[PDB]
Amino acid sequence: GRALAFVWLMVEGAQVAAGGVAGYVRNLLDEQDALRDHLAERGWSVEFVLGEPFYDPGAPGYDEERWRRVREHLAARGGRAVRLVSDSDGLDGWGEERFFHALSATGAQLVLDTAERCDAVVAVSGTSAFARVPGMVQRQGGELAAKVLHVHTFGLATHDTAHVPSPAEIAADGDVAFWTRQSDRVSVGYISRYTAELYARTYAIPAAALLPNRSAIPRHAPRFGVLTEERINERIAGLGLPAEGEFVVMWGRNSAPGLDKGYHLLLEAARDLPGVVPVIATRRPDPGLRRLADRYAVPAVLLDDQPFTHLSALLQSPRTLAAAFLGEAEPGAVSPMEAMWVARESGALVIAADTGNLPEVVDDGAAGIVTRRTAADVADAVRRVRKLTADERRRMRAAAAARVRARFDFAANVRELADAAVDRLAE
Amino acid sequence: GRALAFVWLMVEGAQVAAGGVAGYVRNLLDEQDALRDHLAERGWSVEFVLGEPFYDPGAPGYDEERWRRVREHLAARGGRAVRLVSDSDGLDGWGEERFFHALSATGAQLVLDTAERCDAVVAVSGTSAFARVPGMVQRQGGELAAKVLHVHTFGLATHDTAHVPSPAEIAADGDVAFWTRQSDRVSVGYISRYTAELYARTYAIPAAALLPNRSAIPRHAPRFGVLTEERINERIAGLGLPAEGEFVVMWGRNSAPGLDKGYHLLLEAARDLPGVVPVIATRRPDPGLRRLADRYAVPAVLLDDQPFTHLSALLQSPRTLAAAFLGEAEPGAVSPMEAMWVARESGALVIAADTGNLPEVVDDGAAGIVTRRTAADVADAVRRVRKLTADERRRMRAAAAARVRARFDFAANVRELADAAVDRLAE
Amino acid sequence: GRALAFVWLMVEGAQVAAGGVAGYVRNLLDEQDALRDHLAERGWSVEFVLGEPFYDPGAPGYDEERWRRVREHLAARGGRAVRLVSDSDGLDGWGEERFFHALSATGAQLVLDTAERCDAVVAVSGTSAFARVPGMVQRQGGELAAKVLHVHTFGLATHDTAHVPSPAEIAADGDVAFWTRQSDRVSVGYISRYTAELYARTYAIPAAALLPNRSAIPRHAPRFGVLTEERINERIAGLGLPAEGEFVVMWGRNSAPGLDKGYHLLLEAARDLPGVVPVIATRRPDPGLRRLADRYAVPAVLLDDQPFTHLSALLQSPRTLAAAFLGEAEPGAVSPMEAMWVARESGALVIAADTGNLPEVVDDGAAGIVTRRTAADVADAVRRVRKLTADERRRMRAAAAARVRARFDFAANVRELADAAVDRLAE
Amino acid sequence: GRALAFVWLMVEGAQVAAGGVAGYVRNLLDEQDALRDHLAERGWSVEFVLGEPFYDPGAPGYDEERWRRVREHLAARGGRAVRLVSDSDGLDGWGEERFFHALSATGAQLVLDTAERCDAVVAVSGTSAFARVPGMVQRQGGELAAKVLHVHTFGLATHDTAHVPSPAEIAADGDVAFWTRQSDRVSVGYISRYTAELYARTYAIPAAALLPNRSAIPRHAPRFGVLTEERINERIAGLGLPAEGEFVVMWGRNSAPGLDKGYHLLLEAARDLPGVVPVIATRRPDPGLRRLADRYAVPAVLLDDQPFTHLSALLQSPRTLAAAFLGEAEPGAVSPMEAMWVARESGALVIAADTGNLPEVVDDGAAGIVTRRTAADVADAVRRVRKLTADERRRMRAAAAARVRARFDFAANVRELADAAVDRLAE
Numbered sequence A, B, C, D: 001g002r003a004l005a006f007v008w009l010m011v012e013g014a015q016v017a018a019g020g021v022a023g024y025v026r027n028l029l030d031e032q033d034a035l036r037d038h039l040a041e042r043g044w045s046v047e048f049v050l051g052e053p054f055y056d057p058g059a060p061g062y063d064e065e066r067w068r069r070v071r072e073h074l075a076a077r078g079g080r081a082v083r084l085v086s087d088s089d090g091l092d093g094w095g096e097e098r099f100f101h102a103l104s105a106t107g108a109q110l111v112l113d114t115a116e117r118c119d120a121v122v123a124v125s126g127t128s129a130f131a132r133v134p135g136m137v138q139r140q141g142g143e144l145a146a147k148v149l150h151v152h153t154f155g156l157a158t159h160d161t162a163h164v165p166s167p168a169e170i171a172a173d174g175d176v177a178f179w180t181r182q183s184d185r186v187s188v189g190y191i192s193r194y195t196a197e198l199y200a201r202t203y204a205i206p207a208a209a210l211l212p213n214r215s216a217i218p219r220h221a222p223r224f225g226v227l228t229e230e231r232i233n234e235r236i237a238g239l240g241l242p243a244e245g246e247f248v249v250m251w252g253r254n255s256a257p258g259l260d261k262g263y264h265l266l267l268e269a270a271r272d273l274p275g276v277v278p279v280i281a282t283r284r285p286d287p288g289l290r291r292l293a294d295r296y297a298v299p300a301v302l303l304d305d306q307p308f309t310h311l312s313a314l315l316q317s318p319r320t321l322a323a324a325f326l327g328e329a330e331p332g333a334v335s336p337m338e339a340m341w342v343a344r345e346s347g348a349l350v351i352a353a354d355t356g357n358l359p360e361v362v363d364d365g366a367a368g369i370v371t372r373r374t375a376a377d378v379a380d381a382v383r384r385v386r387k388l389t390a391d392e393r394r395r396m397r398a399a400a401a402a403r404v405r406a407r408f409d410f411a412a413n414v415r416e417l418a419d420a421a422v423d424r425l426a427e
Helices: A021-030 A032-041 A064-075 A097-115 A133-140 A142-147 A167-182 A193-203 A229-237 A263-272 A287-296 A308-314 A335-342 A375-386 A390-406 A410-424 B021-030 B032-041 B064-075 B097-115 B133-140 B142-147 B167-182 B193-203 B229-237 B263-272 B287-296 B308-314 B335-342 B375-386 B390-406 B410-424 C021-030 C032-041 C064-075 C097-115 C133-140 C142-147 C167-182 C193-203 C229-237 C263-272 C287-296 C308-314 C335-342 C375-386 C390-406 C410-424 D021-030 D032-041 D064-075 D097-115 D133-140 D142-147 D167-182 D193-203 D229-237 D263-272 D287-296 D308-314 D335-342 D375-386 D390-406 D410-424
Strands: A003-009 A045-053 A080-084 A120-126 A148-153 A186-190 A210-212 A246-252 A276-282 A301-304 A320-325 A349-353 A369-371 B003-009 B045-053 B080-084 B120-126 B148-153 B186-190 B210-212 B246-252 B276-282 B301-304 B320-325 B349-353 B369-371 C003-009 C045-053 C080-084 C120-126 C148-153 C186-190 C210-212 C246-252 C276-282 C301-304 C320-325 C349-353 C369-371 D003-009 D045-053 D080-084 D120-126 D148-153 D186-190 D210-212 D246-252 D276-282 D301-304 D320-325 D349-353 D369-371
Touching (some): A003 A097, A021 A032, A021 A064, A032 A045, A032 A410, A045 A097, A080 A097, A097 A120, A097 A133, A097 A148, A097 B080, A097 C097, A133 A148, A133 A167, A133 D167, A142 A148, A148 A410, A167 A186, A167 D167, A186 A193, A186 A410, A193 A210, A210 A410, A246 A263, A263 A276, A263 A287, A308 A335, A320 A335, A335 A349, A335 A390, A349 A390, A369 A375, B021 B032, B021 B064, B032 B410, B045 B097, B064 B080, B080 B097, B097 B120, B097 B133, B097 B142, B097 B167, B097 D097, B120 B133, B133 B142, B133 B148, B133 B167, B133 C167, B148 B410, B167 B193, B186 B193, B186 B410, B193 B210, B210 B410, B246 B263, B246 B308, B263 B276, B263 B287, B276 B287, B276 B308, B308 B335, B320 B375, B349 B375, B349 B390, B369 B375, C021 C064, C021 C410, C032 C045, C045 C064, C045 C097, C064 C080, C080 D097, C097 C120, C097 C133, C097 D097, C120 C133, C120 C410, C133 C142, C133 C148, C133 C167, C133 C186, C148 C410, C167 C186, C167 C193, C186 C193, C186 C410, C210 C410, C229 C308, C246 C308, C263 C276, C276 C287, C287 C301, C320 C375, C335 C349, C335 C390, C349 C390, C369 C375, D003 D097, D021 D064, D021 D410, D032 D045, D097 D120, D097 D142, D097 D148, D097 D167, D120 D410, D133 D142, D133 D167, D133 D186, D142 D148, D148 D410, D167 D193, D186 D193, D263 D276, D276 D287, D287 D301, D308 D335, D320 D335, D320 D375
Parallel strands (some): A003 A120, A045 A080, A186 A210, A246 A320, A276 A301, A320 A349, B003 B045, B003 B120, B045 B080, B186 B210, B246 B276, B246 B320, B276 B301, B320 B349, B349 B369, C003 C045, C003 C120, C045 C080, C186 C210, C246 C276, C246 C320, C276 C301, C320 C349, C349 C369, D003 D120, D045 D080, D246 D276, D276 D301, D320 D349, D349 D369
16 A cells, blocks of 8 residues: 655635635645546545635635635545644734744644645645744654655745845745755655746855746636627726727736835826826725826726736726736736636737836737836837737737647646655655 | 543644653553543543654664653553654753644644544643644634634743743743633643643633643552562662761752752752751762762762662661652652552651642651751751651651642542543533 | 933833823923923933834824924033834834833843943833843843933733733733832832832732822923813814703723724713713724714714814813713822813813722812713713812812822922932932 | 954853854964054954853853953953853754854944944844844944944855755755845954855855955964973873874764864775874764774774874974874864974874865965875875875975964964955945
8 A cells, every 4th residue: 555645835725715725725626636536546535635724814814714625525435624732813815934933833733734634745835924834844753754745835035125024034034945955755846947047156055955836727617718809898897998099008016115016107108108008906095096196197997906807808808908017026926827818809908017027928019018027118018919910919929828738737736746756755 | 322531632642651740640641540530430531642743763861662662552442642743853852832733733633633523622722832722723724713822831830930931931831821711611720730820820721611631640650659678778778878867868860941940059058967968869960969968078879860769769678767859849740649658557757848849748847848048047957857756757657748638649530630621511 | 420310211202292201201391401400410410312213204293393383492502312223113002912012121221331431321111122121231241231210110910801901012011010019129119009019919019119200290381271261162163062961071082902092982971971972082093983973873073183172171161060081990090180271261071980090180079070980870980070169160170180280290200200210329 | 542442242252162154263362462553553353242142151162250251351451251142051052043142143243332332333243143134234223334344154055965955954054045245344354265166156246245254363372372392292101092003083072963174084095005094083072983993894983072282292392293184074174284284304104185264275286295185195195105105294384384473374364364354444
């Protein structure tokens, strides 16, 4: 007998789901059966155990029926969902050292509590709050520890933005960087071509310590289905769009001190594009992006908390010129990939800043338009897509859809992770 | 169905056994069946789960066959032994905040990981390294947390000695003191009449927050059996005792900065007692207690690492005048109790300083001789036992044995703990 | 020669001033000359050194010209203002362990760096972020440490509200509680009769370890001057009050998870008081206290960020019935004291909940009206002040003003602190 | 005016002096005048401020008259010695996070408390216990922080030995590694050619972030003076050497878990060298290196706590064949350099393992004999020096002395540090 266990240590995805990490666990479970089958062929019966911190039932994103739905899903295939002790209220999902330390201690605990039940463990840790688990396991776990293979992912402190990471983030990510040159069994999962190179030069990570975990979408999921032109209009009707104009649309987290999504940038570009209406959908009401649109005097449609069903309609209409992604340094943003796959039959084309993963998702100009991160060049970016014949429009639209089939199919890509890890499990 | 679980969170007793905590777990398991039976009568099927930190197989006191013997013992009655992630080498058994914090996080984890399996949990935590578990559980564990009843024991930072506790010890014991006035479900286990009063006045612990866990011996164990006068002489023969003299004997940890066992005190008393030979058995060779005996010019027998089989012979001989216990402030020392029960048919009588639990174990003079902690009064203490007729000698020897039957029978006393906790479990 | 130094370790008051602690430092400096003179008479030349954490010039409450004005004020009398290393951005003023630990290390540093320059030091520490300084100084500072006398003040973790203090707050305040029974030189400054009793029963603080620091106002300051009836009307004109009605007014921090100021309570009482208009002035715009006033259907005047000049006018008008203070458990709220002294010639009377210091500032009914913290009894409280003849109104108004002269004169009260500390400095 | 300050943040050297760091401060002060003069020529009046943690007067290495002698030395040239708050007893000199964190907070405090007094600061930090000071200063110190230039030195966690650095050491050294690619003003001082390359590949330190601080001796000091052949014999007489034999000598810290000095290696080589007597001088009595010499049956002279005056005599005698240095991975050991300079007229030659700085101090075979770290090759190393004519002996002895004049003159080398730092101070 050789049972294999995949321990997903994730800061959200069962009790709460704001986004990002949450979505990765969403897609994770829906593909467990395919991985069970595929890994069966290599001779492993795979159990999934998922670890997530205790939350208090009053937290942003808390859904108790999603919690039970996730708990029975893993029970039914011989796994388990284990709520983990961090050191908090339970109402944040983040914090500092105490949290990162309690949570990484008991995550390492879960990884050993199931390295005894099993014959091998691939422990996928994500976020600085779980960066201390690989060294915690390899230092003290003894023979249980040689069974585990660690792939830590989802973020390592960098200098690529103006924000200086907190001392706690620096400390945690400093550990895994150390334990990758101390241990066979410690690797980093890169979510993109960008973070692949960045993390190897910033941290002195050995070349073989890097294992692929490239960000992606579930192409064949229900939410990415192609809509027809009135289901388009029904959902767009409530959003109060202006009766005339073409649209450039963006969505994601609101802009904050650490994180700059390029919303103000397009509002300033629009000052100089006669028939364009920016449509910016933030996760919370942003009063300043209005005050800016008022100052700059550009007609903007600003919306809050919009369902991906009403956005995937927006991205599909014949009135939508482009979807715009202008983050400061996005390590693994997937919203651009969703925009190219949801506009395969009809839609916007993708404009992407020249900063993070953004250029590799648009294949450096072949599947999208890349602009520098300034108002004059984003105005030019919008103009260039306008100066596109009906035929160059849909050959680039086809090439984008062809890109998410080729490099960003989640099915394809978490098998790439799993197989890369299971190879290292030999002997 | 109502299964009950007892989680013993202890810093030693399975992989290593130096002493103190180790011995408490020794006696703990040998009485599990009696508690299972007794608690059955109250309507609870009781599982035992034991938590202890990962050690590296090179640590002082590490015995791998004791580890498996303890692991199969709990497996065989439906429990488990869970090795816990602290944050260390694994070669100390103590440390500072990081250790106390990792270990108390994953101890709280174990307590919740088994509060889900069960209907009620009495979690016995011991030492500052597990003081943060009660608040960790009650703060974040939600409904799982109302199932648990916490009794933290074995030591709370005090001012009764000249040593100032480390800042980490102050921090940990500061938590439990807080959570006892925050929560129904948090209590302190006092191991003695002394620490009972001390901890209630030092920490502002509510009167009902105190639950009994009074230190004790397993009377009917094999090691406390009464020996006959040549098995006495065989074991004493190798120890190189002087051919003439009567003995005053002491044993325990060597004297150190935080801890003062009163060894130097008796050596100085002996300066003024003509027929007395101090016999001091430390756990390591003490070169200074020799240099002192050389300075003071008293004939002393100093021994290292001696088996309780050779000490229980020493305490039983007709040449042994007294066993002496002169600790600075002993909260729960049990070596005095072992000395009175091992000398029931014949032996030494007990001299005890006026400081810690020492006076309550000798019943304030009725089962032993109490002295102040100075050389002149310990010399007087030895003299007084000499000035004891053959008849007052054995009526006090009988009264001591009667004391360990009445107040320090481990059987009797961990039932006292268990029943006190299970009562609080109502509703 | 015997120079004495007062080290004020405070989390705000020079670079930033939100409120509370800030105001205490405001009043602190304006009375330094009086203390220098008064302490001169006892034979001490007193220097003031003030310690406050580094802030980044973008923080809420940052005023660089107040920083220089405070820096030259202390330079000019032979003291100094020392910006202290905490471990942060510098943009919060609070945080967790890392902050509390860096800031208390370097606060203890400052206290020793000036215990060498001087002959005695009274170090007034305030907030959990400086609770670890007394033990840090007394443990390691040696002979420098016997020169210092510590009075830690401004807050100790309690259970009197529904909020459970963070683990870091519990840890810090757990230290000072320990060091008060370890050391002569460690005391707690109680800011009120309430926190005096609360802290002695919660923490097992020795009776002599408690030293007075009772909260207060600077009576004779410019802002508390009695206004005349049109300067009243000028400032009230912009605030958009309704042309008919009598007023019940409240102000302070907005209501939050840890802190409940009783704003919603009065809005619910007003449902049943025909001629009353609640006027609630929060520090930020509160959208929920509007939605509540809309639900409850009561006419409320809600205002943001209002200057004490426009509030002291509101409290003085003949149309103002009462000022209301309904905090959950206010340890040292001073806004009630400002309301009684600013309405000596004419104004509101004070309604106070039965919870914190609130009852002792209104002398248990003799200088104000005390109500239970529920909507029906606050409605009754308002009614009772209405049922007050013109003559019982102004005899209670006189008795209140007489109370702040007798017990809450800041001049009188920080001399009470200083003298209580300097007495302990003998020998 | 442009005053410059050098802040030496060092864990020992004033109150205690065990060795290593202590000696570096010894040599540091004796050369302050030369640096003051030399830096004067570049236009800087230089003050020296030294920071060291509070110790308790009972600590190993505590010398109060060395403390005052160091305190008046810096006072007399316009500097100061500042005792720093760490978070301890004060009786260790090392510890874990709490210590490293308190000590680095108040070290950063001292660096800013004197960046205000001055126009520029070169802050030399040493050891993991001061690694967090550069980021602490550059993050929060604002304009004061642009004045400081940081050179952290003396050790960065590595994997070159079998020992795994503590998690606290990994955390601290992880900070400085981050802040060197975040900041102009953060550099690493390499003490050797070895650690220069090691640290740049382990930590991804930018090439320009590396500044020289190469370890060295004060050639012209009193202790390195050439002795004549009876002052040789007087000091060797008490040491109980055997009347016949040639000597191979080693000294330094005793061998421990983290640190392996190669003592057992030579004892095993001696098994196969007929006329050789190993003379090993440890800092404490080593009972195991005797038991080994007894097992291996080799005549060894083992000595404790020997004064450099009796060792520099041993290294100078005609009966001394070689001095041996066989550390596992010595980053900056200077005892080899002392051995080559103290045997310029007559002495031993130097045998050096192939591991750390050891090969670069013997210039790869030109100034010494390099061996692999095994008993058979150390036996060969001793043989090869025997197979050396009287003339190849003293041409290699001359080339060694020529090496410490050329690369390891402390005078020359701390000027190299100072000048490298002051160049970066431009603008």
